[PDB]
Design a protein around this ligand. Structure first.
Ligand code: HEM
Ligand code: STR
Length: 394
């Protein structure tokens, strides 16, 4: 029906290959069928914009088939709106500033402390993964090590949400959720008590006030903070520091002027996105110009196919934090489901990188050890590096 393509599981030492591959595909056809994802990938900007706006035709009901069933992302319409308002409260600008001052700045200093006393470290495992894990730890009131133990299971959960037609991926996702249910239940039970003094405690109290604090709803709060708050945020941090390490003159500008960090992060989401976009379910036969999609089909909206559009972003292969306006991020989705955690993720990248750059004026990539980039790095559902080895001192 649509041309066949292999857009995702392709390794390269070039961080731009992923973005370039999606743009080139979009130039050849508006929709491709990906041989690994097993579903159509929409690449054309106008079609993606139509799809994000029309939730009656492009739903998230495919999440009712997997481990997110019962959670926010699987909800539609008014049910979705009501729970979305609860989540929104916890990610308002002032709430985020409060997390920055109370939790994220001190944690970032502690994570950077642990890198001291070593000539070289891997910023992927030792920084990019560590910081978001410890922030979620703080939100749960549980030791970050307990989350560290779930890494394989977390990635197994996510792989089956994306490759949802692959029986091995779906089975491993459901099994991994089963194998994490004890920890999730323990966290919910403790922070459901009147003695809770954690942010998760506050979220569960708000659900209780709305008579929404079912067993399933409370487990799904915890699940969403793990999958988005820990794992997915790690790769944004990783890709931003890679972009700076790969462009030493820009890294030096940003250490001398930390007010440039928001720009470095936004341009990094364009230049080296950690995500392609979203999944949607076609709810009724629909025509997109001369393209036809059948009711029941699950699709990917690959919003990042526009990142390397040279009419929009001249010299798109250049990491340029001076672009104006800054590029609109495509990694958080769109429409009514646009990532509710995005303010926290953006703030963690800024505060974490600020602490790292201030602490290590000599920071530089290990010249000899080039990272390899792929969608699916380390069995994740992210486009990112396999390692970020650095030298910390001159
Ligand atoms: C770089 C970091 C992150 C990326 C790239 C990301 C990406 C995404 C994407 C693509 C979606 C689906 C949007 C759609 O269907 O339109 C999403 C939804 C969601 N994310 Fe994030 N996420 C990140 C961090 C976070 C964090 C830190 C949290 C929580 C603290 C979080 C919680 C959620 C939730 C609850 C939803 C479902 C929203 C809804 O369906 O209304 N995510 N995220
Ligand atoms: C590939 C990627 O990074 C994106 C594509 C679809 C996104 C997900 C969509 C659903 C979702 C809802 C949550 O509550 C947590 C985050 C998640 C689990 C998202 C994580 C990141 C994902 C997996």
């Amino acid at each position: 029906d649509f041309p066949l393509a292999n857009l995702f599981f392709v390794p390269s030492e070039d961080a731009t290959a992923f973005g370039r591959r999606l743009r080139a595909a979009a130039q050849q056809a508006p929709i491709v069928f990906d041989t690994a994802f097993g579903m159509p990938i929409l690449l054309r900007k106008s079609h993606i914009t139509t799809a994000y706006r029309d939730t009656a035709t492009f739903s998230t009901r495919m999440f009712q088939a997997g481990i997110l069933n019962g959670g926010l992302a699987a909800m539609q319409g008014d049910e979705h709106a009501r729970m979305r308002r609860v989540y929104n409260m916890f990610f308002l600008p002032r709430a985020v500033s409060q997390y920055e001052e109370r939790f994220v700045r001190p944690i970032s200093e502690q994570v950077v402390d642990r890198l001291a006393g070593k000539p070289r470290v891997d910023l992927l495992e030792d920084f990019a993964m560590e910081l978001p894990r410890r922030v979620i730890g703080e939100l749960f009131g549980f030791p970050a090590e307990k989350l560290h133990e779930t890494d394989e299971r977390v990635r197994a959960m996510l792989r089956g949400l994306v490759r949802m037609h692959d029986p091995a991926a779906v089975a491993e996702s459901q099994r991994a959720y089963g194998e994490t249910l004890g920890l999730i239940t323990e966290v919910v039970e403790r922070e459901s008590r009147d003695t809770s003094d954690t942010l998760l405690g506050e979220i569960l109290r708000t659900l209780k006030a709305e008579h929404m604090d079912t067993i399933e709803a409370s487990r799904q709060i915890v699940l969403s903070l793990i999958l988005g708050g820990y794992e997915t945020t790690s790769w944004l941090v990783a890709n931003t520091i890679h972009a700076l390490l790969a462009h030493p003159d820009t890294l030096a500008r940003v250490r001398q002027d930390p007010s440039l960090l928001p720009a470095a992060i936004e341009e990094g989401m364009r230049w080296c996105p950690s995500n392609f976009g979203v999944l949607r379910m076609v709810e009724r036969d629909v025509r997109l110009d001369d393209q036809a999609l059948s009711a029941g089909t699950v699709v990917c909206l690959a919003g990042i196919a526009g990142n390397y559009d040279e009419t929009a972003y001249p010299s798109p292969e250049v990491y340029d934090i001076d672009r104006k306006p800054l590029p609109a991020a495509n990694v958080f989705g769109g429409g009514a489901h646009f990532c509710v955690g995005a303010p926290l993720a953006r703030m963690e990248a800024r505060v974490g990188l600020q602490a790292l750059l201030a602490r290590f004026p000599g920071l530089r990539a290990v010249p000899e050890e080039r990272p390899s980039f792929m969608y699916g790095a380390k069995d994740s559902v992210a486009h990112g590096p396999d390692k970020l080895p650095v030298l910390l001192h001159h």
